[PDB]
Amino acid sequence: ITNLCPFGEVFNATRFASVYAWNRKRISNCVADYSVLYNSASFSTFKCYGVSPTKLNDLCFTNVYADSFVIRGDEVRQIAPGQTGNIADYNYKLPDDFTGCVIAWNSNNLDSKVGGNYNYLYRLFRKSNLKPFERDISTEIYQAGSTPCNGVKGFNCYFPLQSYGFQPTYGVGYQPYRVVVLSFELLHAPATVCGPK
Amino acid sequence: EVQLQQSGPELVKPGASVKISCKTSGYTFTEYTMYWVKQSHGQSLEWIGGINPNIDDTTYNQNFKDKATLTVDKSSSTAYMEFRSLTFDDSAVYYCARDDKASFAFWGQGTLVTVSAAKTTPPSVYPLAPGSAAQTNSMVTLGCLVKGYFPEPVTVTWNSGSLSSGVHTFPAVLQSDLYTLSSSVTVPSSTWPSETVTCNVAHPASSTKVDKKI
Amino acid sequence: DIVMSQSPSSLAVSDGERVTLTCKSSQSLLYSTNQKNYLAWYQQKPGQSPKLLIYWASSRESGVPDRFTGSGSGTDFTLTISSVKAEDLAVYYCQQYYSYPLTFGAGTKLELRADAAPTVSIFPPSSEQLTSGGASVVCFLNNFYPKDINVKWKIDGSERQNGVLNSWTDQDSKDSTYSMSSTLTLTKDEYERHNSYTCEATHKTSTSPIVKSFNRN
């Protein structure tokens, strides 16, 4: 077959985005081999929601969305259909009809940054619960009480984005894990990205 | 609604400390914010400070610097306010203010903190009677003084509670760390001085009862 | 800091009349983003905790009756009641939510009406008082209106202010009037060195102050 697309670019990427600013790379009109991601057994945690990993070779879809973000080690349970937590209601939410898979692995040596990584941010405060597959990039000041603050970091008026404290010598805990969410959506349109023939 | 259970009254001395609690029930304690309002001088309201329990932040007023501290208890859902270096001006009623919503802020009952340096003394009753043998007014007035009692208040009844019509009870005034009140009733001339009355007081803190005849 | 004032401090209201309360701030409390005025109106019953009635200066809280209407924006604010009742006898306050620290108002307390005239009832010191080593001449000022009354104490024609204690209570609900006591303390040595003890009260409804005295002999 011809025109083999680089589907493994999202797993071997050199730069990852934050959780509140998660990127979505559209992949279309190519052939993907799913045995590289599941049969190689090189990832730490991986689980498909609704589909079987051995049946993606004969059952194929029209479009795939590749979501990539870096979360903590205990926070991998929040990336699931129907969950609540610190990033499930604020940064990234999966719906109950989620038919994709979640592939994750431990990025200990590369994304370590001894001394405190001050690049990746995440949301603790928000005025409402986040919709599934919705991204929030704008950064205003949260107001949990009746107090107008115009650029004031005083009482009850703070920044709504913190830093991921990452330590290289720690029992696993909040370890940075690179999570790639491959959404598998099947529509009534003619299919574009299918498996090997 | 929102149940705000506060502590009872405290009787402390200047120089010591005191603790004021406010237990919440019905809603999430870690969601909303807690505020404290001190009501002094009878009607004036003063703002002490605030402390959002979620991330434990705390702010104070300029009038209450280095005097009151605010801590929370997540396991019991009770807020704490501890006063240090108490003075005579701190004798006021403290309230627990919970900011549930901007439409209505829920208030508790009030914590009466009386601070003074005095011992519990039994009251001394002095009866009063006019010295005029005759008058043009058809109504006569009788008096009853209550001096040297601590702490406030006492129950003052006239003729064991039977003479309840036309009774003027005055509040207490503080002089030399002791409280003093007075009472007066309006009596028609047809009964006085043809019939006698009595001034019955009762102090629940001292458990003494004095019955003086007028 | 942000300060606020109320005008006036007290108002005599009758059953059925409308009343307006004015709360003026030292600066504008208008937030341009939310387009709301951060100011609250409170009402404290005598013996109870204060409760919030009008929030954001234009909205009525659920459970408050429809007579309480809030208005005003920016600097001038007005709390308007259409028709008061017997349950409206309370004190009102004004609090802003614009900046820290939070500033409370002075307090506007309503009164009753009208036209009470006082009397003077002098009392000699008791025999148990002089046995204890002191003396006390008291004269009660009951059933008067308004509360803005003044009293003087003159002993042997000389005015003395040492030991003058006033005791003023709230308005009695049975007659809508006030009662106030005045106590002058002195020792037994000062009681024997003097003969006449007079107290004199001045009132607005009288063109001459009412005098009353008694003799030691």
Author numbering:
A (entry chain A): 332 to 528
B (entry chain a): 1 to 214
C (entry chain b): 1 to 217
Paper text:
The ectodomain of the S protein consists of a receptor-binding subunit termed S1 and a membrane-fusion subunit termed S2.
These hydrogen bonds and the close contacts (with 4-Å cutoff) constitute an interaction network, with the pocket formed by the S5D2 Fab tightly wrapping around the RBM loop. Besides, F486, also belonging to the RBM loop, form contacts with up to five residues (Y35, N52, D57, T59 of CDRH, and Y100 of CDRL) of S5D2 Fab, formulating a key interaction site. This explains why the F486L mutant virus could escape S5D2 neutralization. However, the T478 K mutation site on the B.1.617.2 RBD is located within the binding epitope of S5D2 Fab. The surface property alternation and side chain enlargement induced by the T478 K replacement in B.1.617.2 may break the interaction network with S5D2 Fab, leading to reduced S5D2 binding and increased resistance to neutralization by S5D2.
